[PDB]
Symmetry: C3
Subunit: 308 residues, 3 copies
């Protein structure tokens, strides 16, 4: 089971600096060559080439609808293709709206997969509840089966097929949820471990519960969508929406180490790394180094050491 | 049900005076406006006027014994008034000596109240054991029954009536306790959770035990006195007496969230916030925001999110 | 039970000159004076003068054998002498290669001693498994019985006799282990607590398990060899081999507080403080003060407070 690195230098999902530079920033640290050092074979697919949809006027409050939908449609076909080939797709991200395509592709092949979403945010606003109108804050809304039809058809997303049930997703790291989002997750019964549950339980018990809940009855593919703002700004400063009181570098690694151990990791997303938003170059260094370390962890690197 | 913001720009409890600007800084951050966005209604009693006592000769070691005792005598009067109005009192103060007026006036109405003292210090020096003479380090000493008549009656504190006992206060965050203080807390059998206990049990079990101790025989009014230096200097740098290795931002919010969950919060103190002590504007903004964040949490704001 | 500080200004164990200045930096932090103020009586033996060996050329790959050996031989005899008289030895070191002499000398007076190694590294590379050739990454290999006869006897170390068995040592803080080292610790079944275990169990649980393991069968003296890089670079930045995701300040203090509480503390090493590797003078003070706080903790200072 090899690894397939897939770059997605896209930012139309949001307004900020240059999240599209995230893939280049990550490879710069030698992420690909480092991955090849694990027991996994690795293939770099390269970065996708996105072309904007000309008259991409806002659909209500939703910005760059057609462009975001066009990019994601392309990504779903690419991820789907590497999934069918029996590989572990790794999307080096731009904004988190690319999770729509990443997960849609992964789900077309492994429909029974589950999603672990590490993020300070739920990204579950619909094109109606979100005032920002930034698609990176609505990916899960476009993917959940229960919200299907709860919002008007959005131009550019007619190819999307709600692929994940509200009970197949687990949030870890929440601390910045909008009113409408908290309503949805609450009314839909979505399982989450906010920073409050993390402080109470400890990351160790959080994983046991995350796994028993998602893998208790039957085992299935795991798709970990990782937003770097999930960890605390001290560790991942170079992101568009940083929130204090985040996951520590240690807890982040624990998460991935545990996920590795399940041997079920099937899809991975490393998103929101925006090098331009570094107050100093070192802040980018920290962000990138933290992202790379997490990525390597998902693939066997253990802090206790490794040997063949 | 209602909430009343009381301002206490008093700094005679310590050699630093920037702590007087605390209320204005918090108010400038939008504390008032944010509290109204909760489930509670809010009232701003405005700031108290502290008439400074002329010939305030030092009482042996104690500094400004009359000026502090008089400022607090008012606070206690103001606080006793809002408490009878059936509202939750919240004091945005300067130094922690004002805890005397806040807690005294609060208990003046609710004598069966308990106290949760979040602080890196015990602030329980008696005018005799204290070596600094700064009253912001002796408040608990002027409030505990067991310590009454155990040190020469200081001038200006005649009006104070020992309200709490040794089994009605719980310390959280201790990491710098002078010898005479450690002697008293243990001789008196005061219940506390120093950083050592927080590290071992974990903040989750820590809150579970304080609530068990203070509210075991019965549910009663809770007074939360929050010294911003209880959180590590990384989070609350703009404060008078900072000590490394304190409670984290997450643990700080955890405490306040839990106390809100009891529905017993009756009195609140947010002290020692001093903007003039911010090495860089971002340090004052960081300190202030955490103080506001801690307050909102006390009144419902949850990290998992909120909706109407 | 008295205490005797022993300076070990040596650095031929690693490539970066400067750690030789560690003992002078610690005293300059008032370590000796702060120690006398606890309940223990203190004596400072001063620093040892090492004899730079002439034709000290590499031994296949290990750098400066004769220099490190003779250096360690000197310390051993000194540590043996102080231990003999019935005092607790505190070795202020240069690089961690001096642990060979600290522990060797300690074991002559207490053959049943156990060892608690706080490090980000296992320092158990052999002259054949290592590659850096630096001996500060091999002290444990020279002390373990199970490792004798697993590599060629090094020139200048024949005075050494493996003193600890694979079951008499416990590691805490591990996060940067070499493949060869990892193979060794799993092969020999050595007990350890990588940051992974600390994240999972909590430092409180880690200490209980460490004591059950080492002091379960029977009670015996404890040797605590503390590498400052065991703590996170945020607290001990001035060290040769910094590694993110380290033990926190609070955890370092919890470890040392629990050790002190056993009453069996007999030998201690405070190593790898390089005051020249500090990118800024404050980073040197920060690392020196952290190490100092750690030591005081090892001899009674508790965050809850102290009093005669
Ligand atoms: N709930 C906010 C959050 S935007 C943050 C998005 B992301 O998690 O991807 O960084 C909104 O609708 O804009
Ligand atoms: N024990 C010290 C403590 S000063 C800290 C006061 B406060 O906790 O209110 O910041 C003294 O007597 O000044
Ligand atoms: N495994 C590395 C570790 S160097 C770290 C040495 B010390 O733990 O003493 O800081 C080597 O063989 O150089
Ligand atoms: Mn996010
Ligand atoms: Mn996101
Ligand atoms: Mn304090
Ligand atoms: Mn205080
Ligand atoms: Mn070491
Ligand atoms: Mn080390």
């Amino acid at each position: 089971k090899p690894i397939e690195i897939i770059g997605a230098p896209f930012s139309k999902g949001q307004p900020r600096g240059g999240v599209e530079k995230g893939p280049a920033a990550l490879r710069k640290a030698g992420l690909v060559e480092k991955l090849k050092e694990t027991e996994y074979n690795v293939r770099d697919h390269g970065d996708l080439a996105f072309v904007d949809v000309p008259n991409d006027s806002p659909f209500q409050i939703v910005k760059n609808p057609r462009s975001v939908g066009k990019a994601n449609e392309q990504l779903a076909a690419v991820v789907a293709e590497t999934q069918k080939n029996g590989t572990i797709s790794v999307v080096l991200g731009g904004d988190h709206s690319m999770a729509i395509g990443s997960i849609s592709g992964h789900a077309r092949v492994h429909p029974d997969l589950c999603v672990i979403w590490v993020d300070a945010h739920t990204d579950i606003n619909t094109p109606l509840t979100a005032s920002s109108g930034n698609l990176h804050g609505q990916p899960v809304a476009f993917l959940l089966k229960e919200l299907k039809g709860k919002f008007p058809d959005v131009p550019g997303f007619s190819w999307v097929t709600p692929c994940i049930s509200a009970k197949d997703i687990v949030y870890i790291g929440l601390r910045d949820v909008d009113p409408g989002e908290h309503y949805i997750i609450k009314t839909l019964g979505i399982k989450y471990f906010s920073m409050t549950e993390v402080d109470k339980l400890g990351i160790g018990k959080v994983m046991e519960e995350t796994f028993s809940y998602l893998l208790g009855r039957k085992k299935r593919p795991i798709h970990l969508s990782f937003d770097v703002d999930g960890l605390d700004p001290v560790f991942t400063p170079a992101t568009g929406t940083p929130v204090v009181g985040g996951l520590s570098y240690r807890e982040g690694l624990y998460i991935t180490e545990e996920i590795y151990k399940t041997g079920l990791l099937s899809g991975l997303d490393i998103m929101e790394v925006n090098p331009t938003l570094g107050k100093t170059p070192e802040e980018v260094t920290r962000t990138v180094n933290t992202a790379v370390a997490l990525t390597l962890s998902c693939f066997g690197t253990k802090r206790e050491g490794n040997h063949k």
